[PDB]
Amino acid sequence: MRCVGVGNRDFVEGLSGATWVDVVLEHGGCVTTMAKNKPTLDIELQKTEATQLATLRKLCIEGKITNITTDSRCPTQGEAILPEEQDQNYVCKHTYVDRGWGNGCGLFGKGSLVTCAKFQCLESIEGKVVQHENLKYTVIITVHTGDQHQVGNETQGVTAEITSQASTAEAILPEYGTLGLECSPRTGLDFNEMILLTMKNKAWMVHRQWFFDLPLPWTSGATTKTPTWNRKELLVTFKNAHAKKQEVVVLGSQEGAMHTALTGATEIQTSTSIFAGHLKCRLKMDKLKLKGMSYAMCLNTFVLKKEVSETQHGTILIKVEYKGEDAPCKIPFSTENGRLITANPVVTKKEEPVNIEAEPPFGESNIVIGIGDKALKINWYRKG
Amino acid sequence: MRCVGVGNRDFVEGLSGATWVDVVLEHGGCVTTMAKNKPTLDIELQKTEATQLATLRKLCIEGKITNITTDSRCPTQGEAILPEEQDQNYVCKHTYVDRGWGNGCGLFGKGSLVTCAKFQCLESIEGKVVQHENLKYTVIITVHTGDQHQVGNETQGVTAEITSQASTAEAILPEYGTLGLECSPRTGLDFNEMILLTMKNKAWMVHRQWFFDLPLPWTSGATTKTPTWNRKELLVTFKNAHAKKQEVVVLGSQEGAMHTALTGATEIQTSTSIFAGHLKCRLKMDKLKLKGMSYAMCLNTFVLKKEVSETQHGTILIKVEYKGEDAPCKIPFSTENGRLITANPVVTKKEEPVNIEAEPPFGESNIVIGIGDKALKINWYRKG
Numbered sequence A, B: 001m002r003c004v005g006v007g008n009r010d011f012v013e014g015l016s017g018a019t020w021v022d023v024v025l026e027h028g029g030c031v032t033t034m035a036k037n038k039p040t041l042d043i044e045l046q047k048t049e050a051t052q053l054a055t056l057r058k059l060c061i062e063g064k065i066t067n068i069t070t071d072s073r074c075p076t077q078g079e080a081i082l083p084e085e086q087d088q089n090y091v092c093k094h095t096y097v098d099r100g101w102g103n104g105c106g107l108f109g110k111g112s113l114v115t116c117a118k119f120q121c122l123e124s125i126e127g128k129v130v131q132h133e134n135l136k137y138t139v140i141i142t143v144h145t146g147d148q149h150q151v152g153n154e155t156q157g158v159t160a161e162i163t164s165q166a167s168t169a170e171a172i173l174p175e176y177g178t179l180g181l182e183c184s185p186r187t188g189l190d191f192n193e194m195i196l197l198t199m200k201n202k203a204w205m206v207h208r209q210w211f212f213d214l215p216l217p218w219t220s221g222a223t224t225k226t227p228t229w230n231r232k233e234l235l236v237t238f239k240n241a242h243a244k245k246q247e248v249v250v251l252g253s254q255e256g257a258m259h260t261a262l263t264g265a266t267e268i269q270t271s272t273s274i275f276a277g278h279l280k281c282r283l284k285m286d287k288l289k290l291k292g293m294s295y296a297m298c299l300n301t302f303v304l305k306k307e308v309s310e311t312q313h314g315t316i317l318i319k320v321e322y323k324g325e326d327a328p329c330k331i332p333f334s335t336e337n338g339r340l341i342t343a344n345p346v347v348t349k350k351e352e353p354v355n356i357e358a359e360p361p362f363g364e365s366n367i368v369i370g371i372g373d374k375a376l377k378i379n380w381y382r383k384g
């Protein structure tokens, strides 16, 4: 009863006689499966993960400038040159300035000037690549056992891992047998065309070309404590207004600009990186066995321990307490179209209440729980 | 000789007989004025300033979030409400979540949830308005005196202030008289349509509508230590992915985004705010008097104290030293089309050299400085 309370909940019933049920799990959704003489299951796709990621390119979003140097020449003395022009850490620019007697040259004319600034990246973002061969899907299965605290509890449930290599897996359901999962991980997208952009805590999924065409300084994917940046001029600007001076300034943090650019992109939790995805599976229930089919009927009384309330999908939840000593026994259930969602409701201990999910028909109907005169009669109306 | 060495230099000569010269000064430019029997002047527009500015609107570029509160209700209990919804410091959002037995409600259905976050701006930018009634133009005038250190020296020169109210002004030129400035401050742009955007040290001139349509939280121009921001949701986002949770996060610094948006805008030095502008003036030289017109000629020798060099505009600079005792005297100057830029070159002291700017004709010409056999003869060729 994990999906009881989830709005995006699907009910799937297997074909007549078949012991297999085909389901489509998607993020934020829950599917309830029913089969004749089989336990009612609540299956959910918990998370979709990428296990190991290789960084393709690394982009600088905030940088600073240090160790500025400059060299100037008088007219007709040739272009000025600095060794830092061949240092890949520095960004340099050549220009011409007005030179004459007033500024220390014998000749009047245009004199060469060159400025170099060492560039250091303060904050960067990464673009890691995801290949579907490394994707891991985690599925969670919860049996409708009637357990006391079962309704909407995300603590209990058996998890099973599906990978592109290990697509079929078996999940051991305690006291109910073994479930088969024959899933086919359909990519949903071409992963070469998409790149995982990670910035600080946050992460997104963006187009490869869009990431590569980001107007930011970039460096190879290989991590280095001292990296060599290209396109450093996309953050460093040289200004020479009136041929007197040349000042170099850095562009400032592009963090918020990236946030705006990432508005229309799919966002991903953390940077453990969990995707929002889907997965199609075939559930083999041949090895699944209903726990209390061989139990006898409960000969005593049931008492309502909680008000009957309606689910968003029209089903009702009944919490009953048994007052007899023959447990474990089968709960007598009959409607005076009316069916059960929970298959084979049973009492395990007298002290523990039982939760039953039922699908009453539209209109007035009488839910009879127990047998005989002392049976519980709950009148109910289902309005469409 | 302030413009000697400036590349953007204009030469203007007054009409025949007139004692007035019309000039157009613009930022980064220098104009040299000549008139018969009048001192040669080097006029320049130093700066254009706005004296007092009123802030129209103030926009937040970086904010943070504190004191988050939230309230939730079970289904059919009505919409949740917080008092912080009526606090203008908080940004709030209403949503609906899945509620049922599992999360503490007796009824299954959609339950109301409301979240509020107190917003605080960390960094802001201002949009101050400039009206042409407060503009101040500063003009600098430098006489061609022949002074020892006059070439390109920006230390010497008389400054005069022109304002839209005080358009005509008089500038006292020591030893040369009084200059009249009849300027007409033409706006160049409609100042209501333009707003001065100031961010940290930097400032720009942008369109009013563009500034008002900036997607940032804004507040009135009046300065307050505790301001009230509008459009706070332009920096604060609420995320509710699957009807389980609602997390509130701030957008981050928009500083670099603003820098990119301001790429095509005119930049202004500091935030003392100096514009790049122009000014048209009429120079009245009726009260200007040439210092040494009544001096006698220099009867002795001149010696070249520095190599003759050519200016970017074809003129030549001659630095001579006088070796006689009759100073002050008129320097004999003759070409063997050839004219002087510096009007009435004179020797003031024997120990101080004299700088003369001359315009030699194209081709071969002989510059004769001094009189007699002992006169200085400098051969020169001007190539076009």
Ligand SMILES: *[C@@H]1O[C@H](CO)[C@@H](O)[C@H](O)[C@H]1NC(C)=O
Binding pocket: A067
């Ligand atoms: C770079 O310049 C600064 C100038 O303050 C100096 O401290 C530093 O030693 C220089 N070199 C390196 C490698 O930091």
Ligand SMILES: *[C@@H]1O[C@H](CO)[C@@H](O)[C@H](O)[C@H]1NC(C)=O
Binding pocket: A149, A150, A151, A153, A154, A155, A156, B102
């Ligand atoms: C949820 O399940 C755990 C596991 O048995 C149980 O201990 C807990 O009390 C339950 N709580 C609920 C349903 O609130």
Ligand SMILES: *[C@@H]1O[C@H](CO)[C@@H](O)[C@H](O)[C@H]1NC(C)=O
Binding pocket: B067
């Ligand atoms: C806001 O919340 C914080 C919670 O840490 C608290 O310290 C503070 O006193 C609260 N109110 C104000 C006015 O800061």
Ligand SMILES: *[C@@H]1O[C@H](CO)[C@@H](O)[C@H](O)[C@H]1NC(C)=O
Binding pocket: A102, B149, B150, B151, B153, B154, B155, B156
């Ligand atoms: C510039 O002018 C000042 C003012 O007389 C003078 O003291 C200085 O030596 C000059 N320096 C130059 C032209 O380098």
